[PDB]
Design a protein around this nucleic acid. Structure first.
Length: 1342
RNA sequence: AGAUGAGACGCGUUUUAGAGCUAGAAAUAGCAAGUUAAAAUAAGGCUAGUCCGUUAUCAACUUGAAAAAGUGGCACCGAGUCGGUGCUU
DNA sequence: ACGTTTGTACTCCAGCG
DNA sequence: GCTGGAGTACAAACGT
């Protein structure tokens, strides 16, 4: 009844690997009983396998389509509101006008009225359309002319102006402060000068209206604007901002000296995320300045459209569109004349061919403005007399349409002013317009605020609003019905996120003063000072740090570190940088912003006004409606002034922090009586940063954080996964891991295991670093030696550039071409510090003789000054310099060894600790007498470097492209590595096994002397012959044992053979998770009308043969149907077994009632109990062993899996990385000799793939093309051959058929679009592990 | 680092309306023009709201209205997708 | 037996700023 | 971008 097994797990985003081992590291195999109606009754199966599934999706797409649905509903409601105000008199002018306008979509055969909607006859409609060629002619006529106009025309203009109404980015009416180009240009310059104040630009005599708004090519407008400013250049920072505001796409990489490219364009949809990334790499003080650039661009593009003399016409948008219409007509007839005289042969191509990108494609085809311009530019350059059209063409103002992509810069008050002008002009001619002016204006200007949300009655997951009365919320009685304060309160309580550390506490705003002081002091506590006579840089004292902050940061915002001491040590301490950058990045921006708002330092400096400013910051952060901001600032009025109230209204902070106030000023250590903010304020001899306070075992912040995280999530498994942090793709994998764990517990006779091992899946920059270092030292790597650092990506090239071509310990240079004379020595040998910081390049010296320390005292005396110069030139990092100076720092100490072992051992990702918490909570469910948890499973978590090194030292090599066996193999290897680490070192269970107990100290456990873990590695106990530092060897015992208990754990000969046998094992359990497809109904494109029958109706009574519609419907699942069908013309009932797919629309209509749906489909005398539901990836087994996975109603996928012998995959790895061995020269030479000695494995593996594909793939055209290509490229080097041989493996891979490329030739995918072979197969119903099956022989069904 | 949520614009697409002219019986040709508007924008659902409809969850079989629970012997020798031997059921 | 109705090979396509 | 839908040309398979 005791089995003593263990479970290993590999968790990925698309895969879960699992394995079961015994105590002898051997996976057991058991025979399982299968159900169904076939004759098989016992399948011997191995307890190792993987589970594959589709990636989980985020809900942003659903959010966007939900939002779009809401705007379409609200727009239709606005139109309907205008209809019900106009109906009673629209009935007088034309009783069935609104019916004509509603049903205008349909065909003349389906119309109950005349075809023409507006007037309803022929001659008046043509007369109207000749009088007003566009809607803007009619709008200008209605605003300008004072004659009595028809009510239908007033309605049409009003509804066009209400339906399309522009944005709401400008609060209040348009005034020259917030609309004019000059005022916003001065605001942008003021923001720039405020942000720097050192070498500023002063623009007082400039005329930004004359330069920016001029009808000029935008590059030349940029050039003229820059030409006025003497200091700034074209590609300067403010120059690139002016270019960005003009509509260009400039690079900001050289502006902030960022190596990565920094092209930012307003017109791109990606600008939001690109600005977030750019601001992340350059600091967030550039936020308001770039926002002002966006505002300047809005003003510029508004004046580009609105470019008519407004003194002669009160409606400027209609007159501007009139001008654009007239210039389009003039250039159209002019272009017609020039292509008639110059190029008459191409006339039908430009003006008639809709398929091309000419004018016919520009008007009738799908050609945009950019593609039309790119088409017509080289034709226009070829003719003569077309200078004007080119001047318009570089300005994007040639043959321009009215409804363009760039009408999004039009604010709503332009349409509101036109509406108000129309209502004044036609006022005294209809009394009802005088009665309902304000109602129509309110219809246009009303906008549901952010905090009110969707107006629901109770049946909504997303609504939080509350009502005072119970009636319909029209826009006019909105304030009389909607309870605004309680809606705002519910919005605050429900939408602001919770903290990761405290799920029941509330985070801070990003610009909130507690978090500002927290981050300032978090970067300030790790700052030393260097003054007069003092050898050891001590950190800044808490009183000194507080005084320095209050005297510099609160006075000059962003403070230079050189200016820091200049004003702290040289001036304040009167003693003329350490632990800091050139300047202190963190600053109290909100503090100085509110200082400029209020002009009272004493109000901000008072600790009693802290909650006042806190509530101000929160209200300006989360709220954006002006009335609600004023209403919640109304309580804060009597302590303030009205002017300051106006400035506080204008200011809008945005963003949220990650910390809670209970986690800064709330948590208090009972033994010490100080907070986290008090520790950062003054910690005496520590001044530890935030992580070090929350990572302290001597403090209660561990016990508080661990206890407060408990019961922050629900008792249910789904609830516990749901509001846990992380991507939904990782949540799907975690849930599948819990499911496979419980069924694996079930399969071993309800036995809890011992361990459940868990593992979570996890050049130009160098050239910029090398060029900066070479320029800092004045090196000849780019002067005398050629500058090719962009192509220097090899490790030898990396080291050679980083060491300036001079070896680290050798006091000379080294030839760049002669890399064999040089060598690479790791600094800390077996931590596995394989990074280039520890991997110094040593030409001759072999560390000068040492055991574990990288340098000697003589080596330190050699590479002291040169290494100091390299660190000053940023070539040598601080960690690398400490490693190279450890010998003069004391060699290798026991504390450094403790750091090395805890570095290979402690995982840092919180998601791993979390998933360990669910599995440990779901398996340990018993309590002791004193209510103590009974640990029956030791949950063990590792990191991927351990198992990666376990692959690369003992040649258990993995390539990913042969089969999906590597998931289960990684799970098995993780299991054996974790169990070996807990068997050899059981006292280290406090470091990585879940739970806090028996903490111990690695400081003394290293023991620092010959006769637990003395060497600088935590996995060295596997290696049978450990190497040394300065070219020496050290043997190891064969059988490993525990120090105290007598237990053999790593007998070398018998366990390596077992792991080889398990890795080379042909059958593991690969299961693809069957899913019912959900999502969109079909493709979203709307196609023109067709005679074909696979067009889906867009509505009920819109037949697609005369209306168009969608196609390619997504099949939810499939149903096997046996029935009869109509045969012949003589009413013959021929029985037919058929597979039919069910669309999502049909999924609802078919799960409602299946039977009558099938009768209405065309089937008769169906068998109701023989309806087999087949979801996606349903496994079918065929003759000889062929497996097919169902992809749709009429498409299958590859189902089999290729089991390659381990010699072949080891050879495939070793030949692939011929030039990337990265080891000893002797080991690399031996590997090269081995791979050049065995090369017939290529022919053997081609025979293997040929037999497998001839067996289960049946794609003989592609297979013959592969064989001919392989014979064509026989005389080829092995390294080039291996990469395309492993590219070849996607022909026989599992899943969808893909298209691949072997060498030159590209092989096209063989798709399986026939399911007629499936109905005479054996359907397989697999469990979550696939150990439990149900096989149905479909030949015997029906 | 990463989930979720609220408010809005601008296009785009599809049908229809913007009478096309001259010569030949036709096939066709030559010529003139073109920029806009309406409606829909997941079919639709009922609790009829200026709501909701693409996230998450899902092998089979037996109970249960659902929720949920329950259903499959063990060792040894081997390995081309798992096979064989023995004990007991 | 004549002639009309299903399987293979290939190409193109997919709402967005 | 991946991968299933749809169209089209063409021959094989077959129903009348």
């Amino acid at each position: 009844m005791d089995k003593k097994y263990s479970i290993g797990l590999d968790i990925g985003t698309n895969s879960v690997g699992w394995a079961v081992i015994t105590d002898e590291y051997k996976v057991p195999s058991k025979k399982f009983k299968v159900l169904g109606n076939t004759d098989r009754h016992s399948i011997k199966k191995n307890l190792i396998g993987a589970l594959l599934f589709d990636s989980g999706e985020t809900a942003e797409a659903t959010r966007l389509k939900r939002t779009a649905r809401r705007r379409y509903t609200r727009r239709k409601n606005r139109i309907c509101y205008l209809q019900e105000i106009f109906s009673n008199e629209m009935a007088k002018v034309d009783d069935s006008f609104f019916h004509r306008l509603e049903e205008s979509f349909l065909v003349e055969e389906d119309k109950k009225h005349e075809r023409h909607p507006i007037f309803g006859n022929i001659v008046d409609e043509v007369a109207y359309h000749e009088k007003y060629p566009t809607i803007y002619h009619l709008r200008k006529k209605l605003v300008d002319s004072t004659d009595k106009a028809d009510l239908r025309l007033i309605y049409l203009a009003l509804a066009h102006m209400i339906k399309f109404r522009g944005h709401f980015l400008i609060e209040g009416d348009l005034n020259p402060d917030n609309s004019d180009v000059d005022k916003l240009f001065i605001q942008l310059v003021q923001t720039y000068n405020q942000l720097f104040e050192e070498n500023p630009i002063n623009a007082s005599g400039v005329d930004a209206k004359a330069i920016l708004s001029a009808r000029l090519s935008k590059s030349r407008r940029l050039e003229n604007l820059i030409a006025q400013l003497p200091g700034e250049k074209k590609n300067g920072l403010f120059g690139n901002l002016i270019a960005l505001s003009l509509g260009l796409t400039p690079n900001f990489k050289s502006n902030f000296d960022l190596a990565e490219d920094a092209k930012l364009q307003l017109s791109k949809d990606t600008y939001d995320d690109d600005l977030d990334n750019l601001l992340a790499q350059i600091g967030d003080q550039y936020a308001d300045l770039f926002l002002a650039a966006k505002n300047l661009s809005d003003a510029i593009l508004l004046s580009d459209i609105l470019r008519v003399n407004t003194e002669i016409t009160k409606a400027p948008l209609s007159a501007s569109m009139i001008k654009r219409y007239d210039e389009h007509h003039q250039d159209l007839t002019l272009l017609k004349a020039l292509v008639r005289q110059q190029l008459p042969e191409k006339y039908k191509e430009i003006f008639f061919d809709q398929s091309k990108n000419g004018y016919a494609g520009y008007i009738d085809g799908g050609a945009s403005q950019e593609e039309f311009y790119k088409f017509i530019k080289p034709i226009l350059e070829k003719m003569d007399g077309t200078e004007e059209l080119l001047v318009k063409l570089n300005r994007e103002d040639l043959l321009r349409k009215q409804r363009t992509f760039d009408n999004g810069s039009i604010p709503h008050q332009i349409h509101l002013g036109e509406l108000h002008a129309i209502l004044r002009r036609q006022e005294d001619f209809y009394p009802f317009l005088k009665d309902n002016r304000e109602k129509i204006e309110k219809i246009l200007t009303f906008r549901i605020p952010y905090y009110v949300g969707p107006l629901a009655r109770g049946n909504s997951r997303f609504a939080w609003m509350t009502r005072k009365s119970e009636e319909t919320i029209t826009p006019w009685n909105f304030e009389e019905v909607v309870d605004k304060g309680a809606s705002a309160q519910s919005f605050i309580e429900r939408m602001t996120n919770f903290d990761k550390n405290l799920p029941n506490e509330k985070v801070l705003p990003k610009h909130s003063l507690l978090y500002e002081y927290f981050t300032v002091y978090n970067e300030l506590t790790k700052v030393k000072y260097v003054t007069e006579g003092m050898r050891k840089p001590a950190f800044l004292s808490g009183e000194q740090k507080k005084a320095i902050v209050d005297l510099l940061f609160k006075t000059n915002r962003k403070v230079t570190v050189k200016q820091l001491k200049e004003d702290y040590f040289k001036k304040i301490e009167c003693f003329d940088i350490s632990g800091v950058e050139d300047r202190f990045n963190a600053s109290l921006g909100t503090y100085h912003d509110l200082l400029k708002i209020i002009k009272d330092k004493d109000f901000l400096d008072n600790e009693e006004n802290e909650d006042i400013l806190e509530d101000i910051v929160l209200t300006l952060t989360l709220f954006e409606d002006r009335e609600m901001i004023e209403e919640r600032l109304k309580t804060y009025a009597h302590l303030f002034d009205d002017k300051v109230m106006k400035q506080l209204k204008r200011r809008r902070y945005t963003g949220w922090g990650r910390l809670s106030r209970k986690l800064i000023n709330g948590i208090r250590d009972k033994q010490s009586g100080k907070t986290i903010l008090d520790f950062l304020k003054s910690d005496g001899f520590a001044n530890r940063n935030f992580m070090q306070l929350i990572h302290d075992d001597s403090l209660t912040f561990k016990e508080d954080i661990q206890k407060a995280q408990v019961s922050g999530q629900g008792d249910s498994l789904h609830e516990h996964i749901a509001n846990l942090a992380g991507s939904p793709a990782i949540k799907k994998g975690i849930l599948q891991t819990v499911k496979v764990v419980d069924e694996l517990v079930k399969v071993m006779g309800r036995h809890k295991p011992e361990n459940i091992v868990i593992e979570m899946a996890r050049s130009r920059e160098r050239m910029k670093r090398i060029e900066e270092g070479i320029k800092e030292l004045g090196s000849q790597i780019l002067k005398e030696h050629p500058v090719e650092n962009t192509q220097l990506q090899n490790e030898k090239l990396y080291l050679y550039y980083l060491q300036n071509g001079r070896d680290m310990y050798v006091d000379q240079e080294l030839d760049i071409n002669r890399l064999s004379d040089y060598d690479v020595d790791h600094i800390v040998p077996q931590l596995k510090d394989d990074s280039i910081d520890n991997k110094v390049l040593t030409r001759s010296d072999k560390n000068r003789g040492k055991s574990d320390n990288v340098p000697s005292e003589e080596v330190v005396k050699k590479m002291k000054n040169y290494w100091r110069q390299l660190l000053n030139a940023k070539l040598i990092t601080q960690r690398k310099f400490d490693n190279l100076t450890k010998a003069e720092r004391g060699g290798l100490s026991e504390l450094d060894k403790a750091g090395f072992i805890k570095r290979q051992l402690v995982e840092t990702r919180q998601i791993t600790k979390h998933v360990a918490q669910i599995l440990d909570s779901r398996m340990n469910t018993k309590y002791d007498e004193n209510d103590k948890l009974i640990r029956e499973v030791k949950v063990i978590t590792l990191k991927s470097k351990l198992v990666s090194d376990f692959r690369k030292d003992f040649q258990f090599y993995k390539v990913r492209e042969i089969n999906n066996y590597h998931h289960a193999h990684d799970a098995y290897l993780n299991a054996v590595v974790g169990t070996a680490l807990i068997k050899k070192y059981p006292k280290l269970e406090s470091e990585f096994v879940y739970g806090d107990y028996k903490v111990y100290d690695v400081r003394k456990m290293i023991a620092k002397s010959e006769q637990y873990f003395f060497y600088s590695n935590i996995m060295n106990f596997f290696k049978t012959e450990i190497t040394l530092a300065n070219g020496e060897i050290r043997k190891r015992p064969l059988i490993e044992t525990n120090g105290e208990t007598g237990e053999i754990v790593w007998d070398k000969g018998r366990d390596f053979a077992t792991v080889r046998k398990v890795l080379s094992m042909p059958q593991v359990n690969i299961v693809k998770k069957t899913e019912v497809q959900t999502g969109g109904f079909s493709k979203e494109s709307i196609l023109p009308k067709r005679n074909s029958d696979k067009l889906i109706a867009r509505k009920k009574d819109w037949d697609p043969k005369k209306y168009g519609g969608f196609d390619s419907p997504t099949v939810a699942y499939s149903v096997l149907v046996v029935a009869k069908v109509e045969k012949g013309k003589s009413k013959k009932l021929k029985s037919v077994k058929e597979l039919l797919g069910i669309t999502i629309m049909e999924r609802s209509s078919f799960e409602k009632n299946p039977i009558d749906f099938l009768e209405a489909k065309g089937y008769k005398e169906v068998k109701k109990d023989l309806i087999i539901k087949l979801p996606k990836y349903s496994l079918f087994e065929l003759e000889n062993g062929r497996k097919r996975m169902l992809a749709s109603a009429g498409e299958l996928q590859k189902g089999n899996e290729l089991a390659l012998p381990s010699k072949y995959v080891n050879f495939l790895y070793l030949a692939s990385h011929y030039e990337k061995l990265k080891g000893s020269p002797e080991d690399n030479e031996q590997k090269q000799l081995f791979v050049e000695q065995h090369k017939h494995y290529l022919d053997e593996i081609i025979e293997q793939i040929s037999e497998f594909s001839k067996r289960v793939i049946l794609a003989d055209a592609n297979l013959d093309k592969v064989l001919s290509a392989y014979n064509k490229h026989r005389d080829k080097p092995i390294r080039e051959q291996a990469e395309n041989i492993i590219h070849l493996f996607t022909l026989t891979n599992l899943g969808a058929p893909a298209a691949f490329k072997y060498f030159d030739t590209t092989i096209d995918r063989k798709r399986y679009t026939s399911t007629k072979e499936v109905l005479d197969a054996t359907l397989i119903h697999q469990s979550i592990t696939g150990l439990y099956e149900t096989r149905i022989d479909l030949s015997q069904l029906g």
